[PDB]
Design a protein around this ligand. Structure first.
Ligand code: ZN
Length: 186
């Protein structure tokens, strides 16, 4: 099972989030992103030093709870029904002409990878636009089992260079749900 532990590594890799009728909102308190289905989720990649050419960025979802971490996160039957992302994949990347949709031969886990690109002129960070294609309610079962998105910075061979992660709740009312959860967190 993929590790969720933060690993800034040698390039000082870490994620940043943007608040984007709320379609996508991030709670620092809960280290949790709340977003609507199939809407743009801007995730920022920050590094202290530019990684080597050929560096890649992979996004993968896993269940948070240890008791279900061996289960593969995938879309529900209803939702697995752009000609690029396989219908079974929860996470899609929007606006990248080099996204690769992968299925691990041994674990059957899904992931989407794009080349790492240095911040463009006029920016201090690199931003990736993710879309979540199924609701937490579809994937969580009775006791709403939460999922985590794990983002890894990798070299051309797949070797780990850095990792960061966040809980994600894909839901109809991101704004309301965040308030409810932060409320309960108090
Ligand atoms: Zn679904």
């Amino acid at each position: 099972v993929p590790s969720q532990k933060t690993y800034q590594g040698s390039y000082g890799f870490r994620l940043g989030f943007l608040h984007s009728s709320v379609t996508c909102t991030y709670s620092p308190a809960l280290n949790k992103l709340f977003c609507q289905l199939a809407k743009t989720c801007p995730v920022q990649l920050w590094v202290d030093s530019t990684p080597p050419p050929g560096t890649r960025v992979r996004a993968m979802a896993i269940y948070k709870q240890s008791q279900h971490m061996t289960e593969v996160v995938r879309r529900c039957p209803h939702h697995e029904r752009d000609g690029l992302a396989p219908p079974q994949h929860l996470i899609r990347v929007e606006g990248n002409l080099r996204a690769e949709y992968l299925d691990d031969r041994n674990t059957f886990r899904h992931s989407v990878v794009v080349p790492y690109e240095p911040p463009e002129v006029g920016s201090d960070c690199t931003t990736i636009h993710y879309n979540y294609m199924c609701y937490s309610s579809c994937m969580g079962g009775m006791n709403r089992s939460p999922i985590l998105t794990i983002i890894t910075l990798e070299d051309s061979s797949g070797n780990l260079l850095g990792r960061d992660s966040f809980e994600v709740r894909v839901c109809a009312c991101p704004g309301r749900d965040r308030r409810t959860e932060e409320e309960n967190l108090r």
